[PDB]
Write an enzyme that holds these catalytic residues in place. Structure first.
Site, PDB file in Angstrom:
ATOM      1  N   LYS A  95      -6.498  -4.653  -3.474  1.00 33.85           N
ATOM      2  CA  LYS A  95      -7.132  -5.427  -2.390  1.00 33.85           C
ATOM      3  C   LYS A  95      -8.223  -4.559  -1.771  1.00 33.85           C
ATOM      4  O   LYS A  95      -7.973  -3.373  -1.501  1.00 33.85           O
ATOM      5  CB  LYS A  95      -6.145  -5.882  -1.314  1.00 33.85           C
ATOM      6  CG  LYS A  95      -5.463  -4.744  -0.559  1.00 33.85           C
ATOM      7  CD  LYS A  95      -4.623  -5.275   0.585  1.00 33.85           C
ATOM      8  CE  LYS A  95      -3.833  -4.161   1.231  1.00 33.85           C
ATOM      9  NZ  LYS A  95      -4.693  -3.193   1.918  1.00 33.85           N
ATOM     10  N   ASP A 137       0.805  -1.231   0.000  1.00 34.18           N
ATOM     11  CA  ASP A 137       0.000   0.000   0.000  1.00 34.18           C
ATOM     12  C   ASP A 137       0.835   1.276   0.000  1.00 34.18           C
ATOM     13  O   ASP A 137       0.468   2.281   0.623  1.00 34.18           O
ATOM     14  CB  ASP A 137      -0.968   0.019   1.180  1.00 34.18           C
ATOM     15  CG  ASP A 137      -1.991  -1.074   1.087  1.00 34.18           C
ATOM     16  OD1 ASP A 137      -2.123  -1.633  -0.029  1.00 34.18           O
ATOM     17  OD2 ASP A 137      -2.643  -1.378   2.116  1.00 34.18           O
ATOM     18  N   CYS A 159      -2.665  -2.984   7.509  1.00 36.28           N
ATOM     19  CA  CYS A 159      -2.631  -3.792   6.272  1.00 36.28           C
ATOM     20  C   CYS A 159      -1.391  -4.684   6.251  1.00 36.28           C
ATOM     21  O   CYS A 159      -1.477  -5.806   5.773  1.00 36.28           O
ATOM     22  CB  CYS A 159      -2.684  -2.891   5.044  1.00 36.28           C
ATOM     23  SG  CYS A 159      -4.178  -1.882   4.914  1.00 36.28           S
TER      24      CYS A 159
END
EC number: 3.5.1.110
Lengths: 222, 222
Positions: free
Chosen positions: B132, B23, B165
């Site tokens: 995702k 990310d 995450c």
């Protein structure tokens, strides 16, 4: 039912909610268990056991499903995964027994004292007892199916450890679209105090909701 | 190949391993992006981009698959789940956009600047870029299927956020029997500094191994 909680109050129906008691075994709660022999501070789990007993009483009266998790494996530890599993290499229970062969076969071993739920917490008929093999109750189990079979979407989390089995089972429920609330004074952490505070931080900030037994029971009484 | 790490060194074959860049979008690393706008500190992320560059060029030299994760949803956030998903209620991005409606559609939206990988990080042919829809890379995507198809067992984690995450994906990696490595200096927490520390204690004590970028590179040199 409206339950005051961080970050805000939330709604749940007890009869489509479950109270999850995570791993209230001698391993995680009693002096002389696994976590104790592995070096963790469990000297303060007396109030957590009581609080869980108080929240298990309230939820059951309110019609919420009671689920007990027992974490562990066969006394051979076939279920813990051989050297080919990260579990073999990270389970601190396995680390203690490899370091203390006297204890080999006992920590988290099904049928054993370590594996028994603490004397004060006794499941009742109609409760679900789930043996899980890994920290998260949502991997390798019928947990999701048990909950979905009953249209449960809210989970009220208790138990030990707040940062390990509780929060893995909560995060993984968030990813399976369960709404998770954690009763902070019905949990204990594995590790230093900040592990408690950061699990409630991570849960409150990104995954779920934090409340307490007292607010939980009070809101159930209607 | 041994990688010096805590709580002890681990052996892995980098050709049976993948580096996951979690990310590293403007949302999570660039000022003016969601995390900044949401009120989290992102002042200190410049060195994380450089360390991730160093790690990436190292992994690829050693033949490790590179997996870039891009978190977020469609511009009307249907993929974020509506009010029936806890993700609708917990997602600070959506919360931040509901607070500041001038930002409706700006945050974590495909096509938006916020969703782009930062300019300094450019997937190369060979890499796998994966979107995702939730914090964890393993729920709702082919991430697990991708790694099985290549016989990978070792994941090496970089990116933001350490506690969320990144930690959720390592955690679920563990439960899917992958060995998880995090390069602590190629990560950045979301929340107070103690959310970096505590996530690392948890990865290290319960779920996997903690290293840093420079040690990682030295392990890949031969």
């Amino acid at each position: 039912t409206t339950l005051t909680a961080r970050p805000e109050a939330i709604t749940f129906d007890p009869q489509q909610s479950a109270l999850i008691v995570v791993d209230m075994q001698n391993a995680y709660a009693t002096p002389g268990g696994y976590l104790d022999l592995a070096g963790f501070d469990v000297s303060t789990t007396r109030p957590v056991i009581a609080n869980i007993q108080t929240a298990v009483t309230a939820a059951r009266a309110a019609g919420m499903l009671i689920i007990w998790f027992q974490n562990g494996w066969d006394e051979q530890y076939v279920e813990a995964g051989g050297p080919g599993s990260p579990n073999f290499h990270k389970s601190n229970a396995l680390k203690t027994m490899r370091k203390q062969p006297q204890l080999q076969g006992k920590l988290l071993a099904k049928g054993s004292w370590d594996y028994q739920l603490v004397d004060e917490l006794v499941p009742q008929p109609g409760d679900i007892v789930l043996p899980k093999p890994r920290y998260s109750g949502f991997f390798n189990t019928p947990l999701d199916s048990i909950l979905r079979s009953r249209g449960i979407r809210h989970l009220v989390f208790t138990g030990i450890a707040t940062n390990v089995c509780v929060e893995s089972t909560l995060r993984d429920g968030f990813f399976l679209e369960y709404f998770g609330v954690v009763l902070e004074d019905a949990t204990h952490q594995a590790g230093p105090k900040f592990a408690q505070k950061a699990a409630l931080f991570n849960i409150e900030t990104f995954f779920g909701w934090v409340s307490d037994v007292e607010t939980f029971c009070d809101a159930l009484s209607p």
